Structures are given as C-alpha cells and as structure tokens.
C-alpha cells in the first residue's frame, strides 16, 4: 500500500479532493490498474490513485446510496471532459473509433 501510494499522483488526488471538499463540500479520487514491467508493486502490476476534478458534477451515483462512502451504491457513473488529442489518446487505450 505504502509502495504504490508514494508517487505524487496519490498525494495530489487527495489534496484536490480536500480542497474541493472544503469549498463545495465534496471531493473524490479513483483507483485504477495497469501493467508495469520495470519496478512493479507486484505481479507485473501496480495500483494507483487518480484525481477527479469537479467531483460534485463529474461523479453522480444516485442509486439511492443512503450513506457517506457510497459503499452501498451500485452506479457511480463518472464523466470525462477532454481535449481532441486526449480523446485520441483515450480511444487508443480502450480501442475505439
């Protein structure tokens, strides 16, 4: 946990979240997985904490989640706003037209 939680990404995802939590009342970040061949946390794999800007309006999960950690929800639909090149680099990752 301490390993793939050292990188700057982990520290940042939080501060943003908190910054947002203070001003608007909310905030969030996500966890994701992919492969590293050089210096993997384990199993040629690592885990990483990603940031989420404008979480109040980018994350919406009304499944009728009746508590704070949305641990009892089933949706959590998120949305991304991105430039042309990004959508390009994205449709490259997830194989899309």
């Amino acid at each position: 946990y301490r390993t793939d939680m050292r990188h700057n990404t982990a520290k940042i995802a939080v501060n943003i979240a908190v910054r947002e939590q203070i001003e608007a009342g909310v905030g969030a970040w996500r966890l994701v997985t992919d492969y590293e061949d050089q210096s993997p946390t384990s199993n040629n794999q690592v885990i990483r904490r990603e940031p989420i800007h404008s979480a109040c309006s980018h994350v919406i999960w009304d499944s009728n989640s009746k508590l704070m950690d949305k641990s009892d929800a089933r949706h959590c639909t998120v949305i991304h706003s991105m430039s042309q090149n990004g959508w390009e680099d994205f449709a490259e990752k997830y194989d899309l037209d």
Partner: peptide, 28 residues
C-alpha cells in the same frame, strides 16, 4: 513546492540511468 521537488527526481533518477549511469554493486 516540495511536491515539485519530487517531480524533479522522477525526472532525475530516470535520467541518470540513460546518460550518466555507470554503476552496479554485486555482493560476493
């Protein structure tokens, strides 16, 4: 700032290995 001090190593460490290099420390 110090946050950027860090991205100044993620950039340095990963740089010496390309150019400066030149080490290796075996045991017995």
């Amino acid at each position: 700032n110090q946050l950027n001090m860090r991205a100044d190593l993620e950039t340095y460490v990963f740089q010496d290995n390309l150019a400066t290099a030149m080490r290796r420390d075996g045991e017995i």
